[PDB]
Ligand binder design. Structure first.
Ligand SMILES: C[C@@](O)(CCO)CC(=O)[O-]
Length: 326
């Protein structure tokens, strides 16, 4: 059982946000996915709470209205899973937790993973556990079990490592590797305000494949071609090509029936206002859409356009993926 070495964290213990750039839904069936850990993050600060047992959560994340209250019971389970995993006993002296960072918690942004990653790093500091990224990622994965469900590993992996990540089901579980990229990704991420059930939509897609094996196989193959090109576009640093491929990916997502009217409105407006590419991101049928801008100034025009002309764009965020290398 781990005992606290520090009385208060002084580090910057964070978990990155996440957007799926390519391959939501198709990844379930063996295709390669591109997941982006964004710069924007959740921070966890910890300090000892002498004589006061348990974990006191001071959650001040800039979450969308109602989100924190909705997710609190899951968060309780999640934090306790991390605490148990790391063998931390708070039955005597507990902990005060402060949760901050600029990441806006909302469905589709991997905010729950960001939370448990930040918490795992903060615990590692306070208890001087010297956790590797691998160990942080596992702690987060375990904790993610407290939210529903089930975690693929993509959210926690993006939250602990950051940057661009190749995600595939291989031999025969989730396999992750970093993607090297030399350019900044200027993203507009848009929340619909609608929460969809990952499990239901995935199972609906499973049923579509069952009902139309030949048609689904074609869409699946069409996807593998897009992500193959997406990888090359990334290696080249051709953002215009990447954007075009994002659009093509969205088209395939509509064909497996994971879009909706609100998402269509957002992507249409994004493209109208000069986005290189725009698509739903993640589960679909609600959640977030993601648009790629060529620059920061061109991102301004898209945000302007969405605010003015797209009422379905309930929440609008400027997110960035920092380059991995010089
Ligand atoms: C729909 C899906 O591809 C992404 C949901 O965030 C499911 C998964 O990858 O486990």
């Amino acid at each position: 059982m781990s005992k606290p070495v520090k009385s208060k964290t002084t580090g910057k213990n964070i978990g990155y946000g996440k957007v799926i750039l390519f391959g939501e839904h198709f990844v379930v069936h063996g295709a390669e996915a591109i997941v982006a850990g964004i710069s924007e993050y959740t921070e966890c600060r910890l300090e000892i709470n002498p004589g006061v047992p348990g974990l006191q959560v001071d959650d001040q994340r800039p979450a969308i209205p109602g989100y924190i209250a909705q997710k609190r019971d899951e968060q309780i389970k999640a934090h306790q899973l991390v605490l148990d995993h790391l063998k931390v006993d708070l039955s005597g002296d507990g902990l005060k937790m402060f949760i901050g960072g600029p990441l806006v918690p909302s469905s589709g942004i991997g905010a729950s993973a960001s939370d448990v990653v930040a918490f795992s790093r903060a615990l590692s500091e306070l208890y001087q556990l010297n956790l590797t990224d691998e160990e942080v990622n596992l702690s987060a994965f375990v904790g993610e079990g407290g939210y529903h469900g089930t975690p693929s590993g993509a959210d926690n992996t993006a939250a602990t490592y950051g940057g661009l990540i190749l995600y595939r089901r291989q031999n025969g579980k989730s396999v992750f590797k970093p993607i090297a990229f030399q350019q900044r990704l200027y993203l507009v991420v848009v929340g619909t305000g609608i929460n969809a059930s990952t499990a239901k939509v995935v199972n609906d897609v499973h049923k579509m494949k069952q009902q139309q094996p030949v048609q689904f196989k074609r869409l699946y193959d069409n996807y593998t071609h897009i992500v193959s090109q997406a990888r090359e576009a990334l290696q080249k640093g051709d953002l215009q090509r990447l954007g075009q491929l994002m659009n093509a990916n969205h088209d395939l997502c509509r064909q497996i029936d994971v879009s909706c009217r609100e998402l269509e409105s957002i992507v249409q407006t994004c493209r109208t206002y000069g986005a290189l590419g725009a698509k739903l991101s993640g589960t679909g049928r609600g959640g977030i859409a993601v648009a790629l801008a060529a620059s920061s100034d061109q991102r301004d025009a898209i945000v302007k356009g969405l605010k003015a002309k797209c009422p379905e764009a309930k929440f609008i965020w400027r997110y960035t993926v920092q380059p991995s290398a010089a």
